[PDB]
Amino acid sequence: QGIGKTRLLKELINEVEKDHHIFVKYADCETLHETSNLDKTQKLIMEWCSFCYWYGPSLIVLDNVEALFGKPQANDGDPSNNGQWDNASKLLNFFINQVTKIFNKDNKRIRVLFSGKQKTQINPLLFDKHFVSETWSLRAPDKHARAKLLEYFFSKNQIMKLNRDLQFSDLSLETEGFSPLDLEIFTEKIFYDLQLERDCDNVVTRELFSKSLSAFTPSALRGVKLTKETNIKWGDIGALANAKDVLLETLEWPTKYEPIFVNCPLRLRSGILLYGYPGCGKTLLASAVAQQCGLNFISVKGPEILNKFIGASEQNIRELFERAQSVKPCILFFDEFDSIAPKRGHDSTGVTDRVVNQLLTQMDGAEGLDGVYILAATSRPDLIDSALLRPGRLDKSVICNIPTESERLDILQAIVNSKDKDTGQKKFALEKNADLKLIAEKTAGFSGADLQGLCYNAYLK
Amino acid sequence: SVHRWLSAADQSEVVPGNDNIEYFSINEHGRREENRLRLKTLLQQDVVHETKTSTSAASELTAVVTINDLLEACQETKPSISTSELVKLRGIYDRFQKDRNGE
Amino acid sequence: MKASLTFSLSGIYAPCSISRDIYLEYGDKKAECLYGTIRLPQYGPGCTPGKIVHCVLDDSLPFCSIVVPSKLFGFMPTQPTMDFCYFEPILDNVVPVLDSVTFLINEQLYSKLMDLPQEMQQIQFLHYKYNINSMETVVHSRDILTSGLCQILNCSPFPQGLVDFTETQLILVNDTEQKLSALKYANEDEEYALPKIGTNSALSIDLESLPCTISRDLLRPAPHINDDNSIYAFTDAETLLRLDVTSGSFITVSNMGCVRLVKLFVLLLPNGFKKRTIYAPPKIIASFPDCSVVTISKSNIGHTDIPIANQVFISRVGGWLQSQKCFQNIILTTLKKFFSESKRILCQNDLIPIAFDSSMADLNIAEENDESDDEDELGQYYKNDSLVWFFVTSAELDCFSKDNSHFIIDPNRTKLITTNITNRRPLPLSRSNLQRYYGFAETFYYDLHIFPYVRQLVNILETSFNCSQRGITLNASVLLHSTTNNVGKATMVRFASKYLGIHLLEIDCLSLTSNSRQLDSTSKIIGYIRAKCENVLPYASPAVIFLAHLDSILLDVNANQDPEAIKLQKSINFEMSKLLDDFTFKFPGTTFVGSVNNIDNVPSSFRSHMRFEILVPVPSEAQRLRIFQWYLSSHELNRDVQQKVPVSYMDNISFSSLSSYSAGLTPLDIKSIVETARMTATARFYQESKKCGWLPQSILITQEDLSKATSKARNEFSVSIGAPQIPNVTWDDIGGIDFVKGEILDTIDMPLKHPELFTSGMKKRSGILFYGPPGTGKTLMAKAIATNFSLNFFSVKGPELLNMYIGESEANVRRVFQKAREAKPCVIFFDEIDSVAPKRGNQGDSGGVMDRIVSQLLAELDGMSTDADGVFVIGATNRPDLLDEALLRPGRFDKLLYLGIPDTDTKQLNILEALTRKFVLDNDVKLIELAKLCPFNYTGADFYALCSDAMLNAMSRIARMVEKKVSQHNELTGENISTRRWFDKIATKEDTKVVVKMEDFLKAQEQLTPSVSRAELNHYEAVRANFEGA
Amino acid sequence: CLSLTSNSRQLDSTSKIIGYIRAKCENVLPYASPAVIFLAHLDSILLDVNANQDPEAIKLQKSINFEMSKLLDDFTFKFPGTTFVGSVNNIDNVPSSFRSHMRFE
Ligand SMILES: Nc1ncnc2c1ncn2[C@@H]1O[C@H](COP(=O)(O)OP(=O)(O)OP(=O)(O)O)[C@@H](O)[C@H]1O
Ligand SMILES: Nc1ncnc2c1ncn2[C@@H]1O[C@H](COP(=O)(O)OP(=O)(O)OP(=O)(O)O)[C@@H](O)[C@H]1O
Ligand SMILES: Nc1ncnc2c1ncn2[C@@H]1O[C@H](COP(=O)(O)OP(=O)(O)OP(=O)(O)O)[C@@H](O)[C@H]1O
């Protein structure tokens, strides 16, 4: 939604009429839905095909086809998926019969043009009946395009103007994952909150821009609880040197040398797993290096997918993967993966097994789906399936080791010297030059969580 | 026997099918392509005029096994049962013969 | 352009005389070597492709007069030929010269002229004997120079072009099969073998329906404008001279009392219709349904002598179309138009065919237009699609004339009254192809000998029809079912119906359903079907009641569903069966046929009540061959080519192959492939047309186009199906393949490529088992086999099957095997069979579950080879020493192929070149040095890791260089451009380009370590030796 | 929309509700601009029906949603200087497609 297809079709209709003389029958599917009764509709499709034939060549078009002809979503609850046919399926069969009969009768005259939001959503009958030759997906706009989209949008309000120092290139850089509708809404926002303060002659500013973006919630991310604001940085986690280097080689290096990896002609490493002692920071270094890369962050925990129905869980996984892929370059993470996709043969109903093959379909599915940076953690990697750890098929795995003297001192110095978000000074009243060396000695066998808890209760004392 | 026969009925004429129609001559100023592209096609691009099937020809001859074939197969085919299994099951069959196995 | 035409017998390659008016258009060109293309009218839809010829000027030729050699075509102009043609002189473009061409010479010419050792003298003799001039003559394929002794076979690159004696490719071939002997031109057969000359009144001759409409411009002499156009019949001139009557005369065809008049003309050469035959439109044939041979006699009735009728009663012929209330208006309007066209000729009890474009049905257009001739030119804006029948029930005359039996109808003087409906059997397809004559969507013609199911079903209808005629009633019903959709069972139903000339009663289930949920659905459906039937059936027998997608109504329902829905379904089904029985009883001879997607879903009761049950399977190899012949047929290709240029494909297509690759598809898929080839052909043709400006005449379809169309269709079908494991692999990606090439090819493709040879009831090769170091390419080689040979592939890891105790392990292998049986042809792989096929009999496990698994797999593997051709089993092992010996036996595995550690530098060289085939390598790379460097213990996976690490190192160097550039330019420019910004716009191509040096490979090799220990190498070699020994 | 609906099941429901809101708003608005149209518990009509429900009701709800959106757009286009405000007790319920189409939050 929001890619302004409707306007694409309208501009199309205009150009085709002006340049090639095709009678065109535009009709949104909402009106047909208004009276989606089989016989009443049958009559309408008869009328259509008749008229369209009456002006050869013709062109039908229906924005939002799924609204009317969209087959109910695969399962839809009824176990009798076969045998009985959905009403809209019968309507699609009827339309298919008429149009294909005319086509065999006359290829030239009538050439339909459907318009939907997803291949699966659209009824597969047309595909099975080989009705559609080829299809095109309208991808999210690119920065270079967003340049002109904004340069026309705030042109629409010819009054407003940008600033000399600021340039549309900027607009493109910060804007991302925004459909033309989203850019429209953002420019309306900027106009309104600019009209808030009537000092400047409607000139853009960096600060108003930043405030608007901060307040902004784009549709793609709207309706989702993205647990991203964590503010855990390098200073918040300093140990696990080897893990830091590997994660940089995996996440920062792509985002820092894209030109080289663009022609790197083996498919890039998809993602890495995390394992180690409980609470040893697996959930921390991931976020820290995500902030290092400044990439989009999502924290997915085992429960989010798990549901009550069988089969519905698979489709929940499906649109989860849809969201994950939509935001290249993004990091997806699964916590407690030992509770998500363990080794097969650990469930009576086998929902775990079918879920696992569903997960495998995507990563093993070679569809250019690599911008999403898959990630996951588990204290019990033994419980995962070996297939989920095949080298080449899947990438390295990251171990978390015990904090020894060196690592303990590193983490203690980092946390005690931590500069606050609210105040900026030390999170704790830190001894200026105390003997932090002897503290690590008595903490042999601890965990970074144990060290920070020790410091925390010391702060309470 | 069929392995032996693979040099008895397949040896007939040329490799299974039709061959030995060769190529007659060429007139090119460099284009000396005598390969099957312009040989199998063109003159007889169809294998035969409106080619179809006919009576039994592919397996015209059955590879009738011979006494030597059976002789060698016997020795090559080792016994499928080890004497240990035979004696064990026979002894157990007699043990149940004390009760049921036999009369 | 329209230019008069005449034929000279001066030889195929004789110069073509052109009227000076024609010569002038060439103008600036040489004016002496003028070349022009021609098109000749074709007796039917479409146009004969233009032939290019060398022309010379001649003022003696009258205005727009041309002369062409008839011998150039397979005929001489004994009888009159077409008077005119369509000429086009190409000005901008010049005649292309074919580099290569194909010919054919009789044995004697080969053995005589070949005597000379020089080809130039032979070709000079060819020119002298055939009048062909290099840089002057244009050669076409399938051209005959000698009457059964000289032939032109093929031309390349184009099928026609200029001749270059020296530079052109010319194939010197002979006719050792005696084919040239039978080759003779049309009309050349008879050396004036004088037929008996007499004034015989009647001459019994064979009758034939016109294959296609004949344009009036081909009537020599041309008839009057207002003459009725529906009473014409034609034949060879010799027949007319036997009847000593002229083209454009009236002649009476009579048989056992039933007689009619006809306008008869001559067929302009060249021929293409059976000799000694009379060709008549369906109009005549219908009145002679059972008469193939018929008597024909002259007529002396003059046009003036024909009486004019005033009132004529016509009873509409009973038919499925006739009963459609939606069409009555349009049919009547077209009927009135048909009489309004001009004066009509009719007799009592005659029949009338009327055609109309049903798509124009509901759009009643311009009836208020009073007596407007413009209606003719909506006709091409129309296109007639379906036909209906009319019966001449009575004619009223007002004066006794010489021709009382016949009569004429004038709209301004004659009145017409429609009356009750009369039954009449429809003509069988044998006597005429109505679709072909009217150019509708001709239904594919089966060859019963190759479609046994269709033959079996047909073997029902005529027997029932006869027994009914013989006074024997029997309720013959049949139900069609299938395992997959898109198989055209309805198409075959229609084909059978037309074959016997029986009325068809088609009722789509998915069209008129209303609300099959409320307490009206049963009643509404029954009433609608009953009404749609009773209105046509009484005057339509014999016919068939066909229910498409019948299962849709009759949905068997489980108990737990809503009881009311259960009751409604029980009703709908029971009353449906009752309606069928009532129909059969009330009208003996009627039979019922139904189409169902899944036989099982039908309720058992009705199913038992059904009489015949037939499934229509997927098309087979020869069936695919026939379907390809049908679709690629020019008639099938040019149904809707409104563009003047015709479409066609070169003869060099190996239809058998296209069939072979067509395995596992359906008729709609084949139609899609043919139309996709149509796509490519038209697109490339228009591309070339704009490029050069010259049209390479018609459009052509090359075997690569169809191959790629099948590829894309198979891709879509695969995305529809489960198998995701055939994406892309080739031999270039993997080395070490040549070692077992012969064995693998012989084991896999020979049974597939020679089944009839393997149809000897022989044990087809069971399978293959591979062992050796991991990552050597075993799985990659198997995938290469699958993708190259295009068989559905599933990968199963033995270990994954094992459950906690035994949840489902045997059932799982059974499911994979059966789903493989559905997706034939296919390949199944077992990963690490040793983990599921260990030596058993010595150790005692905990539960002994595995013993039954191994027994089951052994039994199945032995049971498939007998008949299950198209499905093959392959297993994978890395530690065969653990593998049970029972599998090593032939029948389970017979070719224990091996893929070991690369010993020689050639193995590593092939593996590395296959690995880095797509690497952007600096010229410094000398992979021989690395191959010597790499210890032989390195495996294929070791080389993959090596190449990946070399890429990582090279990308690191490029990254450091990019960072240095970034810092330097940052200090120089004074700003701080982020790396992302540097890469989006500052980064030029060299920044986005990766360069690899030998240093990267050296670093990777030094960083890489043996994936396999040398002790493991010795263990693997010992296990190899021990297995290979036995 | 929590009070006067007077109809929520019948297939005429969607038509009745949309027609009523349209009737009142176009009845009073033309002579009363500038003004604000306010919907109380607007969510109680607009929502995202789960797939775990019969299809035809889902179709009906998709309809009513679309005609609500069209109604607001038509009102703003036909009556310049006009705005509306909606009240909801939980964002997650309102049709995401609808939410995206709106301006302020
Ligand atoms: N050329 C364009 N292509 C796409 N969107 C455009 C274009 N020009 C402007 N837009 C903006 O994009 C949005 C188009 O919204 P629109 O309602 O047409 O969406 P849609 O993706 O066609 O889907 P739907 O009609 O189902 O909501 C508007 O905000 C409009 O200002
Ligand atoms: N270097 C560190 N190692 C471990 N914990 C640390 C470190 N630095 C800070 N901590 C704190 O210790 C806790 C780490 O537990 P956390 O659950 O995040 O780790 P985890 O390894 O992902 O474990 P799990 O998967 O069991 O949740 C947090 O409270 C975090 O703030
Ligand atoms: N040899 C053929 N067999 C079947 N159909 C063919 C063949 N050649 C062409 N066709 C075309 O394929 C289509 C067959 O569709 P039809 O409705 O008869 O199929 P069906 O087997 O009843 O399948 P379903 O009911 O699942 O759609 C028609 O358009 C027909 O013209």
Author numbering:
A (entry chain A): 463 to 923
B (entry chain E): 924 to 1026
C (entry chain F): 1 to 1030
D (entry chain B): 509 to 613
How does the study describe this entry?
Recombinant Pex1/Pex6 was incubated with ATP and an in vitro substrate mEOS-Pex15 1-309 and a 3D reconstruction was determined to ∼4 Å for the D1 domains and ∼5 to 9 Å for the D2 domains. We docked and rebuilt AlphaFold models of Pex1 and Pex6 into the cryo-EM map, starting with the Pex1 and Pex6 subunits at the highest overall resolution (Pex6–chain B and Pex1–chain C), and then fitting these models into the density of the other subunits. Although our biochemical assays suggest that Pex1/Pex6 unfolds the Pex15 1-309 domain of the mEOS-Pex15 1-309 fusion before stalling on the mEOS moiety, we did not observe density attributable to substrate in the central pore of this structure in 2D class averages or the final 3D reconstruction. Indeed, we find density for nucleotide in all the D1 ATPase domains, which we modeled as ATP. While the D1 ATPase domains do not have conserved hydrophobic pore loops, the helices that would position these loops in the central pore are on the same plane, making the D1 ATPase ring planar and symmetrical. In contrast to the well-resolved D1 ATPase ring, the resolution of the D2 ATPase domains is lower and varies by subunit position. This is consistent with a vertical “spiral staircase” configuration common to many AAA-ATPases. In this spiral staircase, subunit Pex1-A is in the highest position, Pex1-E is in the lowest position, and Pex6-F is the “seam” subunit at an intermediate position. The density and positions of Pex1-A, Pex6-B, Pex1-C, and Pex6-D are consistent with these subunits being nucleotide bound, and we have therefore modeled them with ATP in the binding pocket. Both Pex1-E and Pex6-F are at a lower resolution than the other domains and farther from the adjacent subunit and therefore were not modeled with nucleotide bound.
